[PDB]
């Protein structure tokens, strides 16, 4: 569930008589180098036949988030499978990570729709520049002059005393 992004390429077997089968690639969200290949064939199958082990892997390579301190809005376009009911989504996530966005995605999808990690298909990734954010929740973050109340707290339990005689003390002023 560990969200690492991987470039996988796969040609379809190698004959000397028979030249240079075409080279397809994908970006794959996987914790796993193996899951990177696993999803890669399944999505490759959807356009272009190519069953592993009439299938040639090629190279498995992990790709490098360009800006993990970078403060960006991503739109992901998503397909999920419901019980009687496969449908399409666009949702927008504000994350450090394209990796972090997807990880927050599988959790969010899982929750609301009952969203199966196996029942979810990714679709597409783009970084949203600039007011193309339909995103009512998202566009709240873009707002000049972003000060926001800290609402509530979170009470470590109890203490370094199991026995807290100094009463928490919901106050905080």
């Amino acid at each position: 569930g560990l969200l690492k992004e991987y470039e996988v390429v796969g040609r379809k077997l190698p004959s000397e008589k028979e030249p240079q089968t075409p080279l397809y690639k994908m970006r794959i969200f996987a914790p796993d180098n193996i899951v990177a290949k696993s999803r890669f064939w399944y999505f490759l199958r959807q356009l272009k036949k190519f069953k592993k082990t009439t299938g040639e892997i090629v190279s498995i390579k992990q790709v490098y988030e360009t800006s993990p301190v970078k403060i960006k809005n991503f739109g992901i376009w998503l397909r999920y499978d419901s019980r009687s009911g496969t449908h399409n989504m666009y949702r927008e996530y504000r994350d450090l990570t394209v990796g972090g966005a997807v990880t927050q995605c599988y959790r969010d999808m899982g929750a609301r729709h009952r969203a199966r990690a196996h029942s979810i298909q990714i679709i597409k990734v783009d970084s949203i520049p600039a007011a193309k954010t339909r995103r009512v929740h998202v566009k709240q973050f873009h707002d000049s002059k972003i000060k926001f109340p800290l609402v509530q707290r979170v009470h470590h339990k109890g203490n370094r005393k199991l026995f807290s005689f100094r009463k928490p003390r919901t106050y905080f002023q």
Binding site: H155, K157, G158, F163, S164, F165, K167, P168, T170
Partner: protein, 205 residues
Amino acid sequence: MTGLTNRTVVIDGRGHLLGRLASVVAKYLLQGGKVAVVRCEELNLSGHFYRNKIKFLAYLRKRCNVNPARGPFHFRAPSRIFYKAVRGMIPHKTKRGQAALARLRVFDGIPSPYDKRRRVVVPIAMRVLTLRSDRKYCQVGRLSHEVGWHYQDVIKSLERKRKAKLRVTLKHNRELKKLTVKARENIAKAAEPFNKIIKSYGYEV
């Protein structure tokens, strides 16, 4: 009193959730911490007044038909409702569990010597911390009176009487506490046996 740590922990049943408190207490009894739980009418259980009322009414439906006096004791009192919650969490069918129940004392409306005693908070049990905002909750003493607890009226008078003795002791305690701090502060600088130990401690007391 004499214990692995304190053989009597007087616990304030105020703003504790009933099962959260019962479970942590059950552990303490098994560990040998011998606890007394006071103000079980001030004990809260989550889920609306009405929702609790119907849950609790479901058990009295349970009744050993042949001789119902063999049959399930539907314990009215908030102290006894707390007691049932702890007892179920303990293996009370074993002789070890009998020892553990004997370690436990449960009182509604804090009497005898327990009122000049400090009611300790268990912070896991705390309703305000654990329970989400805007969630309606029931108070056990309200629930108790619906299922037939006679003594709701009785304890409320006994608690008021207790609070009044507890008010006068507080007032004198706060007055005394002023006069103790000045009597340290004024002798402190006036030689050095208070300057030596306080500022060599220098932490933040």
